[PDB]
Amino acid sequence: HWGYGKHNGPEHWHKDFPIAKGERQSPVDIDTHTAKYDPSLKPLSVSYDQATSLRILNNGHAFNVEFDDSQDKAVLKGGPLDGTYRLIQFHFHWGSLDGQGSEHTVDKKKYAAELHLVHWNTKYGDFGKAVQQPDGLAVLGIFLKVGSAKPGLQKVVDVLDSIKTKGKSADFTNFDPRGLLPESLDYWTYPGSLTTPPLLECVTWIVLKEPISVSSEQVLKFRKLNFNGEGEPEELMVDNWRPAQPLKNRQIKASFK
């Protein structure tokens, strides 16, 4: 099945998922000089005060922090969006070394990691229905650089030892995703896709300009995770990023001058 190796990685995905060669694939390189300021874009509204995290999962690709999405508890609105989008999960993509790891790039710069907060449009009732719509999902993307520790990340880091291998989960209640956001909510936005199979072209991307800082020790803990299951040959969970895809007939818009 798909993964990140030489034999199953991103250049192979098109054989099982032909939309991989589609018109609105993600990630992309954000050319800061050609993204245009759009004064019609609104500030983003991130309302995570009542978010209810439940569990963390090693799915064999990354780890997912899952939320209770059975009410409007953690919602994204505004920005480029029409209506209300509910938080369902977050996850990261990261590198083997600090010079790579992000999916989006900024003027070809790769960050050490990238966080995706995934939200689905409430007008479609559930996530599985939402991913079938061109405006079904809104993903908030946040870059990670290595420097000072991010205190709000440490609870995640702490728990990773308990989910080392594919298929392991653990209770992860009471985690506050607000502690993962940068100070500014300035963003770029464009229409794209999920960055893992099935690669569905259902996402409004909102990529924050300001990276968060995490420490080398935090990132190093991500790189101790395993893509394999218990008792199988160890293959470190690193380099679980899809490279930038062709922009095609798309515009990237900036919320800021």
From Swiss-Prot:
Gene3D superfamilies on file: Alpha carbonic anhydrase
Identification of the protein by name: Carbonic anhydrase 2
Task of the protein: Catalyzes the reversible hydration of carbon dioxide. Can also hydrate cyanamide to urea. Stimulates the chloride-bicarbonate exchange activity of SLC26A6. Essential for bone resorption and osteoclast differentiation. Involved in the regulation of fluid secretion into the anterior chamber of the eye. Contributes to intracellular pH regulation in the duodenal upper villous epithelium during proton-coupled peptide absorption.
Protein species of origin: Homo sapiens (Human)
Keywords from the named record: Acetylation, Cell membrane, Cytoplasm, Disease variant, Lyase, Membrane, Metal-binding, Osteopetrosis, Phosphoprotein, Zinc
One example of a Gene Ontology biological process annotation: positive regulation of cellular pH reduction
Binding residue positions for substrate: T195, T196
CDD domains recorded: alpha_CA_I_II_III_XIII
Pfam families: Carb_anhydrase
Family: Belongs to the alpha-carbonic anhydrase family.
Effect annotated for changing V118 to K/R: Strongly reduced CO(2) hydrase and p-nitrophenyl acetate esterase activities
Phosphoserine: modified positions: S162, S169
Top-level enzyme category: lyase
Lineage start: Eukaryota, Metazoa, Chordata, Craniata, Vertebrata
Consequence of changing H61G: Impaired activity, not rescued by 4-methylimidazole (4-MI)
Mechanisms controlling activity: Activated by X-ray, histamine, L-adrenaline, L- and D-phenylalanine, L- and D-histidine, L-His-OMe and beta-Ala-His (carnosine).
Effect of A62S: 2-fold decrease in enzyme efficiency, as determined by kcat/KM ratio, and efficiently inhibited by chlorzolamide
Residues the record marks as active site: H61 (proton donor/acceptor)
EC number: 4.2.1.1, 4.2.1.69
Documented effect of changing N59V: Reduced activity
